[PDB]
Subunit: 145 residues, 4 copies
């Protein structure tokens, strides 16, 4: 019977992304699929070179919070029958970085995304990351709400 | 342990939609969910009352063809372990009708869609019916490519 | 001191598109630009070859109605200081045809569009033809509402 | 009929500056008021302990946006455009631009670049433009 083999679940810090992760674990268990959770630290903030260290302080703190969240997720997955969890934090423009991750790891056959994220839940029904990735992903994409 | 209960798969006459239907059957099998396939006959063409019978002839043929496709899908589904298939042909503006179907049958907890359809596979990676439904659906949506 | 030289105003049969045309003539007058109004007859309806005559009867009537609206538009432009009006009725998928038209005539340096059209004013603030054209046009695009 | 009040939201990109330049061209022809708006995006993830770090960053970005505004004020003085209001706000850009137009309902044109700082090698129209075209109460023109 036909199955997903390699799932990607991009997550920001939002409850909607965490609900997408939870469903991605459920999908991974059902299909006995590999699972990768990816947080992108957005590094595109305008700055002159003089402000490099202030930007690093901000992003490295964001990265550390994201790593603490991934550690809790690894513990959670160990209580399920999903076979594994790889966790990854990378820096870049989130939507581009998600697209490139999928395209440059072509074994990935599903992306699981929250409908919304940290910025726009009381303004749109679907955020611009989700919309972009739906558009540009080389594989199936499921939007969780 | 959450599972889908009632899956809606909107189909046009395209191969992309038929691939979406095949996956919806796989999801319905794995979840033992109810499945409904829905073809919308687009009835919005410009016409004066004098041309009603001409348009009616064209739309009635399209409907009949869609019903032929549906009969074949019922036969397919009987070769699988999916519980059932409800088949529906509706007249309306496709993206609005899909949205309304999901909102008006709120037990629907997944919509399955092809990325593209009959019109633009050669111009876009995601068609405007998909993009509309991803935005406006009250439930999870999965885009199949 | 740049000016437009060759403006395209795609119209459907909606009031919103006619308000677009009205503004296109205003822009045309100001820049002393050439103006082209383009109505696309959507010929993408599902039909087998036995049905071509039924479809053609529908499309020819739509085309004839469009031609009468163009006649009225030529009359209106002659009451203004806008240099001219070319009118065109084409057959194809509307958003594709508009894109192709602007690429076929690269002199075109503005496309003027209504925000919405005949199908979706009660569902969206901007229609799918307009968003497609904003995305895909090789030149500036103004949206009229 | 003519435009009375034009808003031209700008980021720091060349695209946006081309948008600004056309906005001046439109403003002169119509003898419309012109406002240029730069929104400092303040949505970065951060805990309270990091408030002052983010403040430092955003305040520098704001300051650069002001140097751009000053150079634009000087350009507009060379033209017969009636005026330039310059403004710098803090918030989510696309939301802020929408709010600005609905909170100043005299605005009858928004002029935008097709793309901006982040995505010209990925999309033909950016997400800020997309959102404003959709949510604006008035005409919107996309410059490319
Ligand atoms: N930085 C990121 N890293 C990884 N995944 C992300 C990131 N940002 C968003 N996502 C994924 O995309 C989903 C939707 O977030 P998105 O950014 O589209 O919404 P939003 O922030 O509410 O709106 P917008 O950013 O368009 O204002 C999230 O639930 C998450 O799954
Ligand atoms: N008339 C319809 N009835 C039911 N579902 C449809 C209909 N039209 C499209 N869909 C669904 O949406 C999916 C994508 O089709 P969509 O219409 O968005 O693409 P397209 O025809 O290529 O592009 P567009 O119509 O934007 O030019 C289809 O695979 C199908 O699942
Ligand atoms: N067939 C056409 N020929 C020329 N221009 C068109 C055509 N259809 C739409 N347009 C142009 O696009 C503008 C917006 O129409 P659009 O089709 O996007 O909106 P809609 O019909 O309300 O929504 P949708 O088709 O997405 O449901 C119109 O005001 C017109 O300028
Ligand atoms: N922070 C801002 N303040 C004011 N105007 C802006 C801002 N950001 C973008 N704009 C306006 O929107 C136009 C398009 O920028 P947009 O942000 O949509 O493109 P992008 O940065 O290339 O893509 P994206 O942000 O979707 O990755 C700009 O040229 C500018 O006119
Ligand atoms: Ca976001
Ligand atoms: Ca379609
Ligand atoms: Ca339309
Ligand atoms: Ca941007």
């Amino acid at each position: 019977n036909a199955r997903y083999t390699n799932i990607l679940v991009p997550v920001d810090s939002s409850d909607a992304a965490q609900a997408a992760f939870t469903e991605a674990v459920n999908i991974a268990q059902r299909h006995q699929a590999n699972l990768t959770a990816l947080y992108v630290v957005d590094d595109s903030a305008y700055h002159t070179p003089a402000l490099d260290p202030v930007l690093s302080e901000l992003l490295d703190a964001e990265a550390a919070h994201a790593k603490d969240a991934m550690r809790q997720r690894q513990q959670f997955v160990a209580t399920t029958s999903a076979p594994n969890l790889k966790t990854e934090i990378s820096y870049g423009i989130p939507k581009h970085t998600i697209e490139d991750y999928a395209k440059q790891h072509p074994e990935i056959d599903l992306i699981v995304l929250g409908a919304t994220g940290t910025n726009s839940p009381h303004r749109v029904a679907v955020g611009s990351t989700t919309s972009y990735v739906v558009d540009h992903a080389p594989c199936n994409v499921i939007v969780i709400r």
